[PDB]
């Protein structure tokens, strides 16, 4: 069971180099029984400059690298280069391609992850894919291939016009919180008549070790009779970026208008988590009326309820 690794060398911008080095590494193959084939769009290569040298020998095993030189013009022609190795009568093929290029003919793709508030709370989890800078919407289609899950949910896509004669298409697909927490991913694939190769964007959960955030509410610091009382709710050591902060002062949740949240910044040292501050400023008329003043934080690694509430009372001091 040999291991195949096909790689393409990096284009040096500083050095004046115009040849890309394709390396096909085969590990643990059969001694004296080897065969490496370079295919360009399912066609055998013609150039004989294929430098093949044994990397190393592991007794019954062997590791060998095949080296090929490719012109930049040929590589940019979207040629699907492939390395084929015949092991035990089975032809294993690996196709590289450069990197499915980039945004073609405009059309910028943004795959927005679900908001970290509708997963572990109310039921409305969805994933959205937005394509902007489109010349026209004719014969342009977006698919929502559900990786490793398939399911039965269907997506819905809608168009929108702007003041710069550009068309933006947004497609939303409902998802499942259990599927998201299990590690399943999705693939937004956009196909347009201009470029034959569709553009694919795959979204999964953010990698890393999840940690339980620490939430603390500070009492107002204003001395005597400042009209606009301020409450601070600090959240530290939370990973990944998915987290939401709200308030539930006296039943109904406080509107986002009288509340703000600072941008997340990476904490220096300590752990790998971030730190955020949420500030709630209210006139000195609700301070003598509101009593609950609870800051709630929703994170995907807190606990089974995925909720952490810190309550501050006005009957202090």
């Amino acid at each position: 069971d040999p291991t195949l690794e096909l790689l393409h060398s990096s284009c040096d911008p500083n050095a004046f180099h115009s040849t890309i080095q394709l390396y096909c590494f085969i590990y643990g193959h059969i001694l004296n029984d080897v065969s490496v084939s370079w295919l360009m769009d399912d066609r055998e290569i013609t150039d004989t400059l294929a430098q093949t040298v044994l990397i190393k020998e592991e007794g019954k095993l062997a590791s060998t690298c095949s080296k090929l030189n490719i012109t930049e013009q040929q590589w940019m022609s979207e040629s699907t280069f492939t390395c084929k190795v015949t092991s035990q009568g089975v032809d294993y093929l690996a196709h590289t391609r450069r990197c499915p290029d980039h945004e073609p003919r405009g059309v910028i793709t943004y795959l927005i992850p679900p908001s970290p508030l509708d997963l572990y709370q109310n039921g409305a989890p969805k994933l959205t894919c937005l394509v902007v800078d489109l010349e026209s919407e004719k014969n342009v289609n977006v698919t929502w291939n559900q990786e490793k899950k398939t399911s039965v949910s269907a997506s819905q896509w809608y168009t929108k016009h702007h003041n710069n004669a550009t068309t933006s298409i947004t497609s939303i697909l409902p998802v499942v919180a259990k599927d998201w927490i299990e590690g399943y991913g999705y693939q937004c694939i956009v196909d347009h008549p201009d470029f034959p190769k569709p553009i694919v964007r795959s979204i999964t959960k953010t990698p890393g070790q999840r940690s339980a955030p620490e939430v603390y509410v500070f009492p107002p610091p204003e001395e005597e009779s400042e009209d606009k009382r301020t409450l601070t709710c600090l959240i530290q050591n939370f990973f990944p970026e998915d987290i939401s902060v709200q308030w539930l002062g006296d039943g109904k949740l406080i509107s986002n208008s009288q509340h703000s949240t600072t941008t997340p910044l990476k904490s220096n040292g300590s752990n790998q988590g971030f730190f955020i501050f949420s500030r709630l400023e209210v006139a000195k008329t609700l301070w003598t009326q509101r009593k609950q003043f609870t800051c709630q934080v929703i994170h995907e690694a807190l606990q089974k309820p995925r909720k952490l509430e810190k309550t501050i009372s006005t009957s202090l001091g």
């Binding site: 003919r105 405009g106 800078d133 010349e135 003041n163 710069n164 004669a165 550009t166």
Partner: protein, 167 residues
């Protein structure tokens, strides 16, 4: 009177380009007799074709060509601009029904991407590859101000507004 024709269909040439002026006219002949006037001053050109290479700001102004004893031709105005985008048209004044060509042109014929055309403050067309606004049948509504915003060398720049008016 003869007509002054420019080899480039646009009278908004760059700084340093070549422009050929022809004093076209029927039943004239005598190519060796053709006087050229720049701001009313006679030039050194004698033939019916005048070539300008590496045009400067001083070459801007009115050009006139006279042949034989006929009356002087129209003083065609040629103006030289120096900016990132100087979108050009076939003519400042276009008769109704005549074709009109508008193209967003960048410095040293550099390729222009993300070309967006705006008419009197309202966008008209958007393209990723530079194209031509070709109005085969000019209409009254086409009158106004045209300007293009283009992304050249990954930098977005705005062109000089135009005065595209039809009769």
């Amino acid at each position: 009177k003869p007509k002054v024709s420019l080899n480039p269909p646009w009278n908004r040439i760059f700084k340093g380009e070549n422009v050929t002026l022809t004093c076209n006219g029927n039943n004239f002949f005598e190519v060796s007799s053709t006087k050229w006037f720049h701001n009313g001053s006679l030039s050194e050109e004698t033939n019916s074709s005048l070539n300008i290479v590496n045009a400067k700001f001083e070459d801007s102004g009115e050009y006139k060509c006279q042949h034989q004893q006929v009356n002087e031709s129209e003083p065609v105005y040629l103006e030289v601009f120096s900016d990132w985008l100087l979108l050009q048209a076939s003519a400042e004044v276009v008769m109704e029904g005549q074709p009109l060509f508008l193209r967003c042109h960048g410095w040293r014929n550099w390729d222009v991407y993300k070309v967006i055309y705006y008419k009197d403050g309202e966008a008209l067309k958007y393209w990723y590859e530079n194209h031509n606004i070709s109005i085969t049948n000019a209409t009254v509504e086409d009158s106004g101000t045209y300007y293009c915003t283009g992304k050249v060398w990954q930098l977005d720049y705005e062109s000089e507004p135009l005065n595209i008016t039809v009769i």
